[PDB]
């Protein structure tokens, strides 16, 4: 009986929740699945023939920037009509209600979809960037960008079905920098597989993890690093961590609680 296996007791989690002064909520793509945004775990991890982790890499962008921009353009256009779900709303409303009591809630998200922002979350660390920002590969400037389509050559492009032909847009016609007449090639302002997360963001993440007294880890596979090690760091300080996922993960047995099921059902219950 010694070995702790995670608890499924909602009442015991809610006893910690009632007292918690600083809650960190870490989210991955599962928190947006109920808005109609597929995760990359299964069939939704394919775009044409490629797996998503093979397109979100600086080697794909260096050698076929038109293909990587078609994939991000597809995602931007699909995301424009997507709405926050009950999970994103519970998260946002929890922050607002606890903030009035002087209690802190912060969201550390792997997602680039901005749906936590749309839901009303204020304290948000977007650790992998944003679908709706660009970064210039020449001058480094980061800009918000919601334009549909981002550039004329991408109009009508990005269809996801296997067998769709590549647009093969010449690099000069991909999104270009307009800042002080720079003209450089833009990329998505998204952290890709093989790249370093921003140091300033990581320092803020470390501060929140070190100071929190309760952590939720929601809709993440806990196999994407370094994010996968955030909630185990909190658990190993002896702070309760509650995982909300439709399945178990490689990190589940490190945590105090595991609440199995769709987070749009379990989050409103846990955060009421």
């Amino acid at each position: 009986s010694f070995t702790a296996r995670p608890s499924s007791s909602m009442a015991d989690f809610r006893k910690f929740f009632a007292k918690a002064k600083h809650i960190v909520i870490i989210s991955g793509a599962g928190v947006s699945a109920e808005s109609g945004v597929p995760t990359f775990r299964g069939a939704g991890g394919y775009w044409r023939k490629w797996q998503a982790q093979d397109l979100a890499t600086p080697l794909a962008f260096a050698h076929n920037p038109s293909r990587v921009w078609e994939f991000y353009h597809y995602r931007r256009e699909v995301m424009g009509s997507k709405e926050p779900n009950a999970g994103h709303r519970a998260i946002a409303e929890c922050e607002t209600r606890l903030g009035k009591q002087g209690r802190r809630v912060v969201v550390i998200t792997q997602n680039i979809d901005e749906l936590h922002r749309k839901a009303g979350t204020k304290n948000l660390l977007e650790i992998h960037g944003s679908l709706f920002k660009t970064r210039c590969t020449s001058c480094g400037v980061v800009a918000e960008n919601y334009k549909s389509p981002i550039c004329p050559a991408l109009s009508g492009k990005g269809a996801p079905e296997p067998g769709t032909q590549d647009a093969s847009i010449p690099v000069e016609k991909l999104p270009r920098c307009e800042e002080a007449g720079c003209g450089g090639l833009l990329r998505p302002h998204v952290v890709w597989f093989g790249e370093n997360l921003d140091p300033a963001i990581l320092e803020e993440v470390d501060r929140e993890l070190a100071h929190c007294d309760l952590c939720l880890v929601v809709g993440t596979s806990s196999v994407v690093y370094p994010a996968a090690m955030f909630a185990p760091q909190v658990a190993a300080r002896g702070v309760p961590v509650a995982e909300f996922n439709t399945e178990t993960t490689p990190a589940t047995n490190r945590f105090r609680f595991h609440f199995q099921g769709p987070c749009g059902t379990t989050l409103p219950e846990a955060l009421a």
Binding site: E195, N196, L197, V224, P226, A228, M229, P250
Partner: peptide, 8 residues
């Protein structure tokens, strides 16, 4: 450990 990767 600042570099993004997949485990397993």
């Amino acid at each position: 450990t600042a570099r993004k990767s997949t485990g397993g």
